[PDB]
């Protein structure tokens, strides 16, 4: 930020860019190092009623694997064939 005008011009010309608009050294646009305290929200299970744990218990819904075949009609694939990707409309070629 403290460079003289001629030096700013010289390095702007050498790099071909306007380097003063996006300096890599941080000045005063960064946040203050002291902030007001937060007040964080609570989660969906913070309730006084209609909140029995047995209705929101993910672990107790896990089940042992389904046995499809054990040693005790059209062909299928594991899933449908993957759809072909489309070219980017933002910038297809770099």
């Amino acid at each position: 930020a403290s460079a003289t005008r001629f030096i700013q011009w010289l390095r702007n010309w050498a790099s071909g860019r306007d380097l003063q608009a996006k300096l890599q050294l941080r000045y005063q646009e960064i946040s203050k190092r002291t902030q007001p305290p937060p007040k964080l929200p609570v989660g969906p299970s913070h309730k006084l009623s209609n909140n029995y744990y047995c209705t929101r218990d993910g672990r107790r819904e896990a089940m042992p694997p389904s046995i499809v075949m054990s040693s005790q009609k059209k062909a299928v694939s594991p899933a449908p064939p993957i759809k072909r990707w489309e070219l980017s409309q933002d910038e297809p070629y770099l």
Binding site: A3, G16, L19, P92, L94
Partner: protein, 176 residues
């Protein structure tokens, strides 16, 4: 969506061909690269003047450990051993007994700072804010034995650093 990084066909009009001949013979794209390093020569360097200047840190920084007290001066640690149980490195060793006044207090509280991974789990686990990682990171030593902290060292750290530690906890305890 995808894009091609390198799938382009150079044009073959005489101007473009000569433009490339000048590039090959006059080194124009190599000269261009010299321009970039020249611009950096005249940019102010990013170097800070350590130890007179310090890199920025935040209240959450995990540094040297310390055992804390209540405002009365009593130790916060009540030898629950939660920090010892959670320590991923098994860096904490604790023994405890009833104090002469009956209090539940430690007789051993060691942290092997060469085992510790400075993960902060111990201070998350502590129910009374007894064990913390303070903001000090400048405590390298000349011997290995100097990094095997016992309770006296850790309490001295707390007394040494409590002014900063309390302010750091004040800034961040509402995110915890």
């Amino acid at each position: 969506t995808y894009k091609y990084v390198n799938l382009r066909e150079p044009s073959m009009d005489m101007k473009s061909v000569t433009d490339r001949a000048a590039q090959t013979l006059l080194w124009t794209e190599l000269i261009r690269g010299l321009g970039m390093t020249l611009s950096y020569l005249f940019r102010e360097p990013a170097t800070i003047n350590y130890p007179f200047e310090k890199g920025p840190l935040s209240p959450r920084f995990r540094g040297e450990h310390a055992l804390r007290r209540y405002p009365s001066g009593e130790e916060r640690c009540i030898a629950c051993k939660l920090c010892e149980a959670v320590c991923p490195a098994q860096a904490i060793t604790i023994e405890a007994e009833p104090r002469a006044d009956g209090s539940r207090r430690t007789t051993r509280y060691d942290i092997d700072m060469t085992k510790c991974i400075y993960c902060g789990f111990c201070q998350e686990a502590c129910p009374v804010d007894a064990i913390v990682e303070g903001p000090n990171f400048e405590f390298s030593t000349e011997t290995h034995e100097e990094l095997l902290y016992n309770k006296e060292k850790l309490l001295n750290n707390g007394d040494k650093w409590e002014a900063e530690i309390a302010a750091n906890i004040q800034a961040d305890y509402l995110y915890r």
